Specification:
The structure is a homodimer. By secondary structure, chain A is α/β, with parallel strands linked by helices. Chain A folds into five domains: 94 residues; 115 residues, 3-Layer(aba) Sandwich (Rossmann fold), CATH 3.40.50.2300; 271 residues, Type I PLP-dependent aspartate aminotransferase-like (Major domain) (Aspartate Aminotransferase, domain 2, 3-Layer(aba) Sandwich); 139 residues, Aspartate Aminotransferase, domain 1 (Alpha-Beta Complex); 95 residues, no CATH class. Helices cover 48% and strands 13% of the residues of chain A. A seven-stranded mixed beta sheet of chain A has the order 6-15-14-13-11-7-8, with helices on both faces. Chain A has a five-stranded parallel beta sheet with strand order 2-1-3-4-5, with helices on both faces. In chain A, β19 and β20 form a beta hairpin. The longest helix of chain A is centred in the middle third of the chain and has 38 residues. Chain A is globular, with a radius of gyration of 29 Å. The two termini of chain A are 58 Å apart. Chains A and B meet through α11, α12, α19 and α20 of A and α11, α12, α19 and α20 of B. The complex binds pyridoxal-5'-phosphate (2 copies). Chain A: InterPro entries: LL-DAP_aminotransferase (IPR050881), Orn/Lys/Arg_deCO2ase_major_dom (IPR000310), Prn/Lys/Arg_de-COase_C_sf (IPR036633), PyrdxlP-dep_Trfase (IPR015424), PyrdxlP-dep_Trfase_major (IPR015421).
């Protein structure tokens, strides 16, 4: 899987340009009559390196790499230079088209011809064209697909040598590495084919699959207009792309997709386990639904003032506490953001397994707004909610899993349920129901238009339990005149993932890893700038190429490299004012979040190596100016700068945990879930609301006049509601908000103070809550 | 004002074509040497007709029309023909700008020069150009603005022969968006002699202000508190709001933002029963208690009207007798009903604020964003009504009128107040009006783009925090910029083009209505429902028609064209399908048992009207063909279909009740529809009753209560809402429907209703 990201093959385009400049240099040597030995040896070495992988690309190929070796071994420098220049020119735009309209590479794994028959079947006028990349082994097939993103389809012989010269298991590896490419089987034994009998129906089937994954029914219909129907087909193709059972297009973003799902699954007073640092759209969806959130604290990253992911032990503990309270039955759903804004990726399969061990019929909503692209690539795909859900269902169905569960139950003889937090947990096969949901803001990660989203449903009980509720929620939240351009953009993004998705997203990951490497190695940047590692953003408690492939497979959290938290603390300037006065003011670089000492940069499918050079050059320029200041600075200026660096990096205020809801708003005194809807509307009783200055708040806590938030206080440096309606304003929250000079705090106005419930109000509400 | 619609000068472009037709033929007579007397007299008559109004337009105007008169009186037919052809050609595309880039006419009301000075100030290279249409009177000024929709600015002398402040208000009344400037030589207002250069700059600046689209231009520059704030401020000024909020998810969501912002759970909301579904879902989200108000029936057509104001007043006074008036927080009415019935907001707000001086009004004006362009429809718009209502309350003249009204109400019981036209107390009535506009439905804006318009006196104090939280609740954090830029473009459209555009639509609707009435071949098979059809006499009391829009309780908007097809003997559903769509591709907005609703919009053109007329002529021709080919048995079957479609129509069922399980107050009709909505998802408490069994079960007394919104296609509105009693009328209505598009009701399963055990348990809890 993750090996596909790291190989010479991805940099092959650069290596071919390198060959084109070595070959030109060889020509410049030969035209001068000088000793060619140096540049012939250079070109030979480069081409021999290229020959490690060029067999897997249609146009330059082994045939023409060999032809160039033959030309070079005859010192035909002029011809060799001309042909290499031509080859790399065609390569730059015609990646594989020069092998011969849509054009796709089709892998044929056949050591045997079928290739020539399929070529003869090709009609040059057809709208979609392909050329066969023939490979003579299973290992060569898997390498070809993984390395070559252009291989839209694969054709596999039943008889194939596993060893490389230089079958169901081959097919499963192709499906694993390249989830969207069409995979076909040939079988001479007395989709699968008979190779001799059907080369014309094989050709037709390959063309049909390619058109199926290229055709955009709704975008084409909208073009024809502008010049149950096509929208159903587009949603079905989206479901097939994102491994959902059903897909629902939403034209008010994932803010509204979240609410549709929450309302569909939750009735008023359903307990929802939710990441405390969830998107605000979840907080508002909860107040709308009237569900009782039990907020789960994401583990702290004190050095950076950012939250991580919610540890699985936290979820398990919450569920088991609710069970001890007898409130587990009420619990209806867990809301987790599969990739945190900062890039901390949950392992959904493990979280759903251990949660369904506690609550076999809980629903999962994964707010994967940033991870729509992830389905394109196997390493991130496996961590996607729909793929995790399918894999979990397929495990729960297997008899071998049933034996494994029986052994696990035997291992759990006499273990208390309270202890279950200590031990890894397996869902019951005969009770665990897989009811997984995802919401994708396609625009954030893909070409889709802004405000276009996709709810992905893989729920075993959707048709009975949730279909009517989900229809009524969809009618509640969507407008009756949805914008057709947004839906067509979702169809276009689906087609992009289906065809271009693997190469695009793999390139994004490559570019993010290249940027990380260049920033780390470069001594001029590295002294002033840092990009936070897995070890920075993911504690050891949660981390256990082979080891890095296993990390994405099996670790609880991984850092997605495409989320690039540039730590700037060594520069001694706020993240906010680094974004403003350097990135935006000087360089126009947009970024997604700022932090006290770090700036988050998210690479997307549109990133190019030119963008990576731009960012690297920008950081080099800033480092140069910082070195200029350091060498011009007096000892007093150096002292001030060192003080700023300490302020930005050392005495950071710990981001506060969720202080509980007030007993006025916790329905169960024994349980942490709160009636946050009630507190939300109660905060609009102006007789019940008052304002407490934060300088007075800390003293009032000593008086015991319990401060309880009426409103979502949402400081931007965290970026999350630090208080929610009905939340106890704790000593740590007072302290945090006091240590903030930032002017963008929503719901908190330092001119007035914290909007808090009056003690009389709280007393009355507590009385009501009792009786 | 409405006479700005019903005038000959609208057709002057056609009439100028007529001259070209009549002038060219004159030449064809002269070139043959024939007697010209016939065609010279035709041209003279036509031009004399043109001359009654052409002085109000720039390019041909009094000058060229007088030149053509001279030519025609000298029989210079060839020259006359050429210059008429040239003029009418230029008139068609550039006929404003040919008087000389944005180009606008500016009226100068000046009988006196400022004109030549302002012309001299003009620089041909300027982005925005204008030429002065000078007129010599107030009445010529008023007529010029009203007729010439290309006039964008007015400059008025203080001394003007009527045959000036009153003049100005008529300009503002008729042309609310055009910039209105005053000249005043006495020792925006100007000194005519002193400042010809700053007048010029001011005119240019105002035109630029209403033309400049800050956000669309910014989005173009990007694609090649900030501009979005400026666009919203310009939208507020265009739609006469105090504030405007751009909702990217459409009026569906604009409605919910407002309802959430104004209502807390348990706050009674009076609402029309024919309200859009987005209000039903907004109520279950907000937890408000709807008191659904019956729109008056139109039994012949199976459509609802508007909610009578007596019904609103009675509901408020019933809630007062129950002691529940204080809970009431808002009245929700759709200012224009789907079928075109226009409420008079000023009268509804006045008489409602007499009962509940601090009620908020949300006007779901999704179809009426265009209306603000034109004075007749504008005056019936929520924001203009709110401003006029606010101004009236502040005047001391109204305080005396209110004192006289209170003196007239001495000893009258409040129960009788439904009988008497009420007046709001100026010392208590707070004007808290809201509107939501689906700009796309009525204007060029992109689909799903909406504008909440707020004119609320207590917005800053009470609603500002609640409205921000609701706006954060319902809008997405990554709104589509193209939708917002489309709202800026639609604002610019209304600011400049809107009057001529919208006034053209009404003209087109009236033309279409007139042509359908006169044409004997269409009129025998097709009808467009009149005011008298869609508005009972009880609610209706050129000058008479102007007073109707000003003062009648309801009016029919002509732009909503309910084509009655019952005489054709085919369903409105299958008329849309098997004729309009199948044969002609004609899209329409709604269908009914015997009618099809066609809504004209700014893009409507006379060519579209010929298409519609020709289509109805073709269908009438085929129907006449069938009538003359039909046997007596075929004619009998056809007569039966007409009776089925038109005579024994099932009455649309009024709202019944919310049940005692869901009515929080036994004495009051409002119900906790939220609780019923979510109670309907307990599968142990829900059951299905077949409608063939439902009528019997009502005789058993096993009260049927809907768990879900049952939305039958012919009405298009929830006939049942969660927790509503399924009445004999509703059972009968749903039994008499063969339609397959009923949401929430599956005839395979039956009506989803609460079990009797569930109802008993819920009622037990509600009482105690
Ligand atoms: C995690 C997450 N969920 C939801 C949203 C909201 O989605 P949208 O921007 O489409 O409204 C955002 C963005 C987000 O970061
Ligand atoms: C009266 C009315 N309100 C609300 C809506 C919904 O608004 P939108 O079409 O933008 O979704 C419609 C349309 C409507 O006709």
């Amino acid at each position: 899987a993750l090996a596909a990201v790291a190989n010479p093959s991805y940099t092959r385009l650069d290596t071919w340009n390198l060959l084109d400049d070595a070959c030109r240099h060889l020509a410049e040597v030969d035209l001068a009559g000088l000793d060619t030995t140096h540049d012939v040896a250079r070109a030979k070495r480069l081409m021999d390196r290229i020959g490690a992988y060029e067999r897997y690309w249609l146009y330059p190929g082994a045939q023409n790499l060999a032809t160039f070796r033959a030309h070079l071994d005859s010192h035909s420098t002029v011809r060799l230079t001309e042909e290499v220049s031509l080859a790399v020119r065609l390569l730059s735009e015609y990646g594989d088209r020069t092998a011969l309209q849509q054009f796709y590479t089709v892998l044929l794994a056949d050591d045997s011809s079928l290739a020539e028959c399929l070529r003869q079947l090709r009609n040059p006028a057809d709208e979609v064209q392909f050329e066969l990349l023939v490979v003579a082994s299973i290992e060569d097939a898997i390498t070809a697909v993984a390395l070559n993103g252009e291989i839209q389809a694969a054709i596999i012989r039943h008889d194939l040598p596993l060893r490389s010269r230089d079958w169901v298991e081959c097919a499963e590896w192709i499906r694993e590495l390249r989830p969207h490419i069409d995979l076909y089987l040939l079988t001479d034994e007395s989709r699968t084919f008979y190779r001799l009998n059907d080369v014309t129906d094989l050709h037709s089937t390959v063309l049909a699959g390619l058109r199926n994954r290229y055709a955009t029914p709704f975008f084409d219909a909208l073009r024809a207009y502008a010049a149950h129907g096509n929208i159903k087909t587009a949603m079905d193709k989206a479901a097939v792309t994102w491994n959902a059972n059903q897909t629902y297009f939403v034209t008010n973003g994932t803010s509204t997709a979240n609410k549709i799902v929450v309302q569909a699954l939750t009735r008023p007073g359903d307990i929802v386990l939710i990441d405390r640092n969830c998107h605000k759209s979840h907080h508002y969806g909860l107040v709308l639904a009237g569900a009782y959130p039990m907020y789960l604290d994401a583990y702290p990253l004190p050095q950076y003032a950012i939250y991580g992911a919610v540890p699985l032990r936290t979820i398990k503990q919450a569920l088991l506490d609710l069970e001890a309270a007898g409130q587990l039955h009420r619990v209806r759903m867990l809301l987790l953001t599969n990739c945190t804004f900062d890039g901390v990726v949950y392992n959904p399969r493990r979280v759903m397994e251990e949660v369904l061990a506690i609550k076999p019929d809980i629903c999962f909503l994964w707010d994967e707004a940033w991870y729509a692209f992830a389905t394109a690539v196997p390493w991130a795909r496996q961590r996607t909610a729909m793929i995790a859900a399918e894999r979990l269902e397929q495990m729960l169905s297997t008899a071998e899993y049933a034996e494994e569960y029986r052994n696990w139950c035997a291992s759990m003889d006499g273990v208390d349920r309270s202890e279950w937090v200590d031990h890894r947990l397996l869902p019951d096969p005969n009770r665990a129901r897989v009811r997984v949901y995802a919401t994708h803001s396609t625009h954030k990660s893909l070409s889709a238009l802004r405000q276009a989203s996709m709810i992905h449903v893989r729920d075993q009980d959707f048709k009975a339990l949730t279909r009517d509720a989900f229809g009524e929620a969809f009618l509640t939240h969507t407008s009756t005149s949805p914008n057709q351009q947004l839906l067509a953009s979702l169809d276009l993004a689906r087609r992009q993932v289906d065809i271009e998705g693997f190469e695009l997203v793999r390139h994004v990951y490559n570019m993010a890893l290249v940027f990380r490497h260049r920033v780390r190695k470069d001594r001029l940047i590295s002294k002033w700038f840092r990009i936070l590692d897995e070890s920075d953003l993911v504690p050891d408690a949660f981390r256990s190429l082979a080891d890095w492939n296993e990390a994405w497979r099996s670790d609880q959290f991984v850092l997605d490299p495409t989320r690039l938290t540039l730590f700037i603390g060594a520069t001694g300037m706020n993240g906010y004012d680094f974004r403003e006065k350097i990135l935006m003011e000087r360089f126009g670089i947009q970024i997604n979040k700022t932090s006290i000492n770090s700036v988050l940069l998210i690479f997307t499918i549109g990133v190019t190596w030119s963008s990576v050079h731009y960012l690297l050059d920008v950081l080099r320029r800033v480092a140069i100016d910082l070195d200029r200041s350091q060498k011009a600075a007096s000892g007093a200026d150096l002292a001030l700068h060192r003080r700023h660096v300490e302020e930005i990096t050392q005495d950071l205020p710990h981001l506060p945990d969720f202080s509980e809801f007030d007993l006025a708003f916790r329905p169960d005194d024994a349980s942490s879930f709160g009636d946050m809807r009630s507190a939300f509307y109660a905060g609009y009783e102006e007789a019940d609301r008052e304002y407490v200055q934060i300088g007075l708040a800390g003293r009032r806590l000593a008086e015991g006049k319990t401060l309880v938030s009426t409103t979502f206080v949402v400081p931007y440096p965290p970026g999350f509601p630090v208080l929610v309606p009905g939340q106890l304003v704790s000593k740590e929250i007072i302290y945090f908000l006091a240590q903030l000079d930032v002017k963008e705090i929503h719901g908190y106005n330092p001119d007035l103070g914290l909007s808090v419930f009056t003690q009389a109000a709280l007393a009355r509400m507590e009385a009501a809550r009792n009786a």
